[PDB]
């Protein structure tokens, strides 16, 4: 007795994967022409109503199957390459250099004094160039001869000194026909249904921060530290630990650098490290010990709900790999740091700052994204760098190999940058609206 | 009350808000070579989806309606629930889960009943 | 019976299958920088062609119909064949060959008759 | 008499020529990588604008009309001029200047009156 | 008692900015494969009805807010760069050269005889190259050594010898939904309402002519010289003077040049100036004095309606700047000329040709558009160049600093190429058609 | 008494030219990342109903006016260039080399032993490189000095050793609104009406095979050999001969090559021919004589229906031109062969394999498509190549100059690659569906 009735404009949707548009936060800060993110995401935001609650609607979320992480990965890499693309190349620097130790005010030889004949603006002439280098960028050929470490593998391009990569919050917005569903459940662990759901046109602004083994400058958890993993019991997976409190880390590049330049072609400029004013000190980062200790104790209270509260949680340092794998990698003041983390994971829990200083390495040729391809050269920065970042979470793995002794070992995980972006993206899902549908009614079409 | 603001509403109550979703299909009105192509492709895709919904309504004889009664009887095999539950207790999202496997059946039937009636109109004239 | 499966059918028989061709206009629903542009351009072109057919039907007052009678009389100068041959012996492809030079005449006349009638409706209201 | 040939005509006289402007929306039918993208983007933009006009007419219940009477009363606050001036002395461009600040009011009201009537039709059936 | 009635297809419009399509004039002249404009604007015109009058419609125009000038600027530059892009680069020529004076039949030393070892098709060999250069492209390094003047600033690319940049008339056409409104009012001064309005699908064909301090080959004013300015009383703005009569200017490159070539890589060809047959003469341009005098007197009659007819109009030469700023810059026969203008502005008006010859400089490395970036190298032209152009207008500024003495000084303005294009564009406006609208009627919808 | 009735969805169409989408055959074979065609036509096929018969519909076909050949030409070339584009360039190899004859186990000197100083990864050093070359790639400069033959004309780029160009069947699919009409008439000669017509969404898969003077690996004719020409009686046109039986041709590169490599820049790798293990033999191809003889006799039976069965058909070899013109050119095992064909056309017909071996030349610098532009360098292949291809047709021309003696001479034609693709494309036509149309009915619109 019922008939099909067709309804158009029906408030339903399906899981969907599309490309979101990016926007800067209404260009609140112009950045002039010196910021890559601001330049790319030139599109403004608008402080319109931000969300629509969906009462009585339960939606299923899974942060490890969230394609927005793939979009950020793709867009971040793509922009970085477009940014570097028009800059001056360093092919002319793939030469043999003669090097000696730098001994001036040095207690540890991290730097080498190297020199070579560099191409000048005329093809007929070369300029003798003398500058200091970090050992991490220099390899012996065999007052020995050395070369740039990557000149056998790929081209090296100098980053334009005029372009900052400083993260700005970026909002991602749905295309017409799409909506983003946001989970506000304070207890959401990254997988399953969420009842506290509202929709948005755009995500809030997320900074495109890149780091290894430690999550920086993200949002904080409410009430408790939340540990999220696709597979908690799998020692092969990274567990993302979101703190409900931040910890500050104070990093520096203490050597007062004097930057020198040279014309190496027709308007082709190269910037070199020059020399250091004053004495030499290792790059380093400082963390208050008690704060760190409290932070791990909080992490332990949470690990225990997954592994047993009769357990022993042991922390340990990185198991092995390259700097890009084992150290805490971050950009500070525009420079690239590779810091030790082992002093942070030297304790176990068994069921006047007094800070810890972590030594750091400085490297100028960057194997960005751990991708085989062109390397970036980071031009030197004049003066001294100091910055303070917010530790907002950790990335850990277990060693496994357990015999159920109740003692488990946790070490820095890291690797894939996607896992940092997941820290904010776990809250959002993209769906496609499907407005056309049918239902039975007690109504036959009138036929005329 | 917002796009999908009716998502938790009963189907009856939600049918009274259909213009809310219809108007969000062409929101592109309000809205670097490689990047620009992908941005443009997205607009083209949204247009094709819009047009397909309109074509289907067109073929079924509902081109100008948000709600239309048709000449296809309801199959209890698709759903044997009464209309009272469907319209007063259940929401549209739940309903979609209940009958999604018959989408293509219903649509094929709608095309057939309308084609037959259009022929009848032409023969009557 | 397939797209253009009615191509060898008489015009009458073929008119009963019009939904078959209508549904193949938006088949893009089911469906490297330089290459991608050309691939995208093709979709845009298909959309404009679709829209033009719809606009013409719109203007002529046949926006919701596959078949519509109009207010333009048939000219024997376009074709002096009887309807019996046209509908029962001849196919649409053959018919197109018979009257293609008048396409623009008929269409202009359709626009004029509908514009006059729409004015009449507004004056009557 | 040409696109916008009626621009200096009175609104009444100009309403009799509405098919003239409607037919110029899809003129793209008659109509280097970086350049080609910009050329293509222009076509996509024209399509979205076309579709939005059609959607609005659709929602308001005027999907098949060039001219339609509606269920929204005229507010003297938008314009307190009589119809005689509006239709016989004034042109459409002048009229647009007279009421452009109410465009969104009238359109919102049109959506509301049509939604109410469509519900009434469904309840009556 | 009145109801809203909705009307679709309403003949109204709004000011709008879009991109117009360009077309050649129906490819009336093929140009084969040797013309850049013809190649880009491959789209034909059609001599269909050209215009629709809009009786009783008044439209407001403003030539200084007309976005079509921006489009021409963008398209002209973009095409020029795409045209140059695939041509052979001159990076191999950024060498040190030894130079001596050219003294052969010279009364003024404009040319230098320079030589160097140039790269040949094999990487193992160089060819000694000897050629003559204009001093404007040559800078001393310090029988002294010299270099190409721009090799410290940017790459130099040779224009393909096969591609002409000769302006062809280009029509600009509206996208669907857009229309171009044309003002035919003979008294229109560039700003305000126009009643003589008609619409077109496309503008007439405008040649993409580039010049400094003098408008060439444009249309003429009817009845009187018309002086147009965004701000007449502002001495900081250029006034565009459109003549109602043309003045011919006869320019030449009198030196019978012999062009020589060399292979400098794998199919990489370079063309050089070789030497000169016969004697040496300065490049120059000739203008009949009386015609010029009449022309300025006509300009003065018009200046007086803006500044007072009790005034004294004094003309003076360029105040300062580079050749690209102070001279009359134009392309003649494919060569780039920088001519003196001071002899043209040596008079004042107080309320058998007898021509004036203006000496000219020839330069081959062109800082096109006064943009910082790659330079173009203009290959030499075989033989002797003669051309005649039409002076159709002037670009002037006032010095200002006036004490209301009634004497005002006018000097060549120039600078921005946009101002030349404005000379034709002032007649046209782009609008968007808005077909959907409403009006009251004595008609309620019939409700069924 | 009849009125216009408008019908939408009418099954009619017009001849039309559009771009078809390409698809691999459902990625039945992955090819990993080593096949260019598979990579480009990433789009899968679907074994859905393949065709719709159109009973009582006659369609007119013309294989010489078929725009699908133009699309294949354009897409094949475009892909080939995109494939080569990112590979390492050989500009550094355009040097002078010293060469001597290779005499080691040689009875015929096809190879030369050449050496030079090649650029290494550092700009300061060169490596002496010794390798063997085929004479076809080497030209004397004048223990004499030689150069790469194309270094005076264009850049040479090394094909990536990781990318295969092995043809895969590619299907071409219609855009929405388009259909492809297929003629199944076994007697269709390439022009005129066909009654055996069905439509398809996509063509069957056609391999993008390139060859000169002999059609390879195409489909076979049924019942008889079919000779197709736009102009049978015109001696200036190629006649395409489609066999109804295949003939196998066994080709080899018998020299057991040892491949050597070198780093010539920052990850820039070059692969060279090294040397040969064992002795030296000419490249060659074998065809059974009797099979070939039968094949030509069948061709003759068909030529006689066009020229008279009282005729004498004489076959002769290529009349002249370069290897790319006169030889049988094909890719075998990835190598480029230029084989003699004259032994195949040494007979006339007058109204234990016993094979014929055709000597072949091997060339590494390829003037692909006979286009002026960049050359491709084919890196050497390790070991020995053997392959067997299917002769599926011939491309012939007549000499003409006939005095009606009844004896006509047929020689290899070739030239344009489009003619090979025509061998499959003759079966298909692209049309545009035009669903909107009118017809008279005895029905006036009801006016209300
Ligand atoms: C986590 O978040 C913290 C901040 O919350 C980030 O640290 C900040 O990083 C920025 C960028 O390096 C630092 O800003 C720099 O300050 C330098 C001088 O500071 C004084 O002057 C500025 C002027 O407005 C005042 O705002 C400031 O209070 C001080 O008075 C500037 O010289 C730097 O400018 C650089 O870029 C411009 C671009 O054109 C160049 O012209 C300059 O020469 C120079 O290169 C820059 O502005 C900021 O101080 C940092 N904060 C702290 C606490 O140190 C962390 O980096 C972030 N971590 C992660 C992982 O994202
Ligand atoms: C007409 O059609 C014929 C076939 O019908 C084509 O000839 C074939 O060409 C392919 C491509 O060169 C040949 O395949 C090659 O075989 C080599 C070894 O063969 C043995 O191992 C394979 C492994 O699966 C077995 O399938 C095969 O039966 C044998 O057991 C491989 O080493 C070759 O691989 C190459 O590419 C890969 C890509 O990553 C590289 O890694 C390898 O190192 C290597 O470079 C390749 O697979 C095939 O044998 C040929 N057939 C015949 C009869 O010889 C004609 O070319 C074709 N003609 C035209 C004009 O198109
Ligand atoms: C979510 O569910 C609650 C009930 O569980 C809905 O509450 C109803 O609200 C209407 C509003 O007039 C009342 O008439 C009903 O009596 C309420 N139900 C009950 C059981 O009291 C609420 O509206 C639902 N949310 C949405 C979006 O519909
Ligand atoms: C092709 O032509 C034949 C006739 O020449 C058509 O056959 C007709 O089929 C209908 C089917 O019911 C019969 O009623 C007719 O009597 C048949 N005709 C004759 C002369 O017997 C066939 O249908 C045509 N094909 C198409 C596609 O219409
Ligand atoms: C421009 O204005 C004039 C009047 O000022 C319009 O002239 C009218 O033309 C109609 C045509 O039938 C006559 O019936 C009217 O009597 C004329 N008006 C007067 C005052 O005589 C003219 O038509 C207007 N232009 C346009 C485009 O409408
Ligand atoms: C610096 O001194 C250490 C001491 O052993 C030595 O090994 C190293 O090679 C020296 N470096 C240079 C560049 O001399
Ligand atoms: C430049 O090259 C010479 C080799 O002839 C070398 O002695 C000199 O040290 C080089 N210059 C520098 C700064 O190394
Ligand atoms: C269209 O006009 C041409 C002109 O010769 C004519 O041959 C053809 O048959 C005409 N077609 C129709 C349908 O009248
Ligand atoms: C719109 O509002 C502005 C506000 O000052 C007013 O000046 C203008 O006349 C208004 N236009 C209409 C159509 O009411
Ligand atoms: C040419 O002669 C003038 C005369 O003073 C001199 O200054 C100039 O440098 C000379 N140029 C060359 C290249 O010798
Ligand atoms: C080439 O270089 C040599 C320097 O060894 C120089 O003497 C010679 O003059 C140069 N050739 C030319 C034409 O300057
Ligand atoms: C190889 O020997 C032949 C014999 O005449 C000679 O002509 C040829 O030039 C030789 N080639 C080389 C590289 O010596
Ligand atoms: C490298 O160049 C030198 C010239 O000084 C030449 O003698 C030597 O033979 C070259 N090396 C090779 C392998 O030809």
Author numbering:
A (entry chain E), E (entry chain A), F (entry chain C): 33 to 140, 152 to 185, 188 to 309, 312 to 323, 323A, 324 to 397, 410 to 506
B (entry chain F), C (entry chain D), D (entry chain B): 520 to 550, 568 to 661
Relevant lines from the article:
The sole target for neutralizing antibodies on the virus surface is the envelope (Env) protein, a homotrimer consisting of three copies of gp120 and gp41 subunits that are associated by non-covalent interactions. Methods enabling the production of stable recombinant trimer immunogens based on the ectodomain of Env have catalyzed recent HIV vaccine efforts. Hence, the efficient trafficking of Env trimer immunogens to follicles following immunization is likely essential to promote optimal humoral responses to HIV. Here, we demonstrate two strategies to concentrate HIV Env immunogens in follicles, via the formation of immune complexes (ICs) or by employing self-assembling protein nanoparticles for multivalent display of Env antigens.
